[PDB]
Every structure is written in structure tokens, then in C-alpha cells.
From a paper:
Vaccines and therapeutics targeting the critical viral spike glycoprotein (S) must accommodate the mutations in S. Even the highly conserved region that plays a critical role in membrane fusion exhibits up to three mutations in the HR1 region of Omicron variants. To reduce the public health threat of Omicron and future emerging variants, we and others have proposed development of antivirals targeting the relatively conserved heptad repeat 1 and 2 (HR1 and HR2) regions of the spike glycoprotein (S) that drive membrane fusion by the formation of the HR1HR2 postfusion bundle. Although the ~130 residues of the HR1 and HR2 regions are conserved in all prior SARS-CoV-2 variants, a few mutations have reached fixation with Omicron in the HR1 region (Q954H and N969K for all Omicron subvariants, and, additionally, L981F for BA.1).
Residue numbers in the entry:
A (entry chain C), C (entry chain B), F (entry chain A): 918 to 988
B (entry chain E), D (entry chain D), E (entry chain F): 1159 to 1200
């Protein structure tokens, strides 16, 4: 009798732990997707910022150069 | 003269997502609490 | 006798797994909070950067325009 | 003349936090090691 | 005159890493599936 | 006999759960390392951006000032 009890409660525990492991796997997968997406976002931001500051610098030197031409 | 309008533009298409794993954390805590209904009491 | 052994060690294992699942839940919660906070930080940075580059562009066109006025 | 000092400002109030879940990872590894003291040896 | 070339530079050395925990998620799902081979069938 | 069965399958389950907990610990450790690294990256980006915009502002005021000198 207590063998049916031990078996049934062990099966219940293993089912609950299966559910918990599937939930942990789904959570880690979502976290991985979002962390990688934010990493790609930060990387494309640093790249586009490099380009934008390059353009800013360029127009700046054009300004200074044609100013020196004025002076 | 008549220098063109040098528009730098905007940082378009850059945006960070958001994790929503509250369901999974709730499931984990619910299982950690429900495992007390799986202890063996001979 | 071995039934008391199986029951006691199963209860010990279930207690340890309860502790592990609570720890995993706390860790995933902290990770979620920090990932969402860094996401909001990156988003407000891209917004404030858009505004800042807008202002930079604006003063730049003012510069070029009043320069053309000079020339 | 006398153009005002056009200060763009600073990116204030923007800062990223830091995860510190080392306690939880240590607990997980400690439990994974202590579960060897829960194996049944009839 | 002859104003120097005021180069602002570049945001060098800034780069975000990438998580690769696909092995661990696969292991977790594999264990969640293999625990069905540990159920007791008296 | 069924006691050997319960014991052996419980030991199998505990081994699999040990493997799962070690995998979860490794995954959380990697996630923590990468999230902290991206956080440090975002922080150094905001700092270097503050400095870069400071320099941009500075050369801008130099431009406006020497322009006013021209005018």
C-alpha cells in the first residue's frame, strides 16, 4: 500500500518537476532572445552613431575650412 | 552659395525589446509551492 | 524500514528541489528586471539622442544659413 | 550679434543596472551537489 | 588662420556580447523529456 | 523487488535533476556575464557620448564666437 503511495507521489513530483524544467527552458529561451536582440540593437546603434558622428565631423571641417577661406 | 540643408537624420529602426517571463516565474513559484503536496507521509 | 529510508530521502530531495526552484525563480526575476531596465535605458538613450542630434542639426543649418548670408 | 551659448547638454539620468544573481547560482550548484546526499542506498 | 582638422573620433572599443545558452536550453528540454523514463510503473 | 525499482528510478531522476540544475546554473551564469557586459558597454557608451557631445558643443561655440567676431 505505502508502495502505491510512494510511487504515486513520486510520479506527481516528477510531473511537477517536468513542468518546472519546461518553464525554465522557455524562460531562458525568451531571455536569450531578448538579450541577443538588445545586443544587436546596441551594436547597430554604435555603428550608426559612428557614421553619424563621422558625417557631423565632416560638415564641421567643411564649416571651418570655408570659414578660414572667408578669413 | 545656397548651401543645402545638411540633415543628419535620425537613429531609425533601433529599439530594444522587453522580456515578459512573468508567466514562467509564476509557474516556477507555483510548482515550488505545490511540491509540498507531493511529500510522502507514510 | 527501507520504506522510511525511501520516504525520508525523497522528502529531502523534494525540499532541496523546492529550494532550487525558488532560487531559479528569484534569479529569473532579477534578470528580467535588469534586462527590462537596460532595455528602457537603451530606448530612452535612442530617444534623447534623436532629440540631441536634431538640435545639433538645427544649429548646424543656422550656421550654414547665416554663413551664406555672410557670403 | 552676441549669439547665445548653445549648450546641447548631457545625457543625464541614463544608466544601466547590473544583475547580481551570484547567490542564486551558488545555491543552484550547492543543491546540485547536495542532491548526492539524497540518493537511496538500500 | 588654418584651423586644424577637428576630428571628433569614433566610439571605439564599445561592443555588446551575445548569449549562447542554446546548449543549456536543449539540455533542459531533453531532461524534461527523459524524466518520463524515470516514472515508476509498479 | 519493487523497492529496487523505486530506488533505481529515484536515483535516475535525481541524477537527471542534478544535470538539469547544473545546466540551469551554467545558463544563468552566462546570462549574468553577458547582461553585465552589455550594461558596462551601455554605460561606457553613455559616458563617451557625453564627452563627444561636450567636444562637439565646444567646437560649436568656438564657431559661433569667431563668426560673431567676423560679424
Amino acid at each position: 500500500e505505502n508502495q502505491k503511495l510512494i510511487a504515486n507521489q513520486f510520479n506527481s513530483a516528477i510531473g511537477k518537476i517536468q513542468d518546472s524544467l519546461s518553464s525554465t527552458a522557455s524562460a531562458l529561451g525568451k531571455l536569450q532572445d531578448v538579450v541577443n536582440q538588445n545586443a544587436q540593437a546596441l551594436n547597430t546603434l554604435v555603428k550608426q552613431l559612428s557614421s553619424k558622428f563621422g558625417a557631423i565631423s565632416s560638415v564641421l571641417n567643411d564649416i571651418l575650412s570655408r570659414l578660414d577661406k572667408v578669413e | 552659395h545656397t548651401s543645402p540643408d545638411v540633415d543628419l537624420g535620425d537613429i531609425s529602426g533601433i529599439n530594444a525589446s522587453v522580456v515578459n517571463i512573468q508567466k514562467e516565474i509564476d509557474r516556477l513559484n507555483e510548482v515550488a509551492k505545490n511540491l509540498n503536496e507531493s511529500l510522502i507521509d507514510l
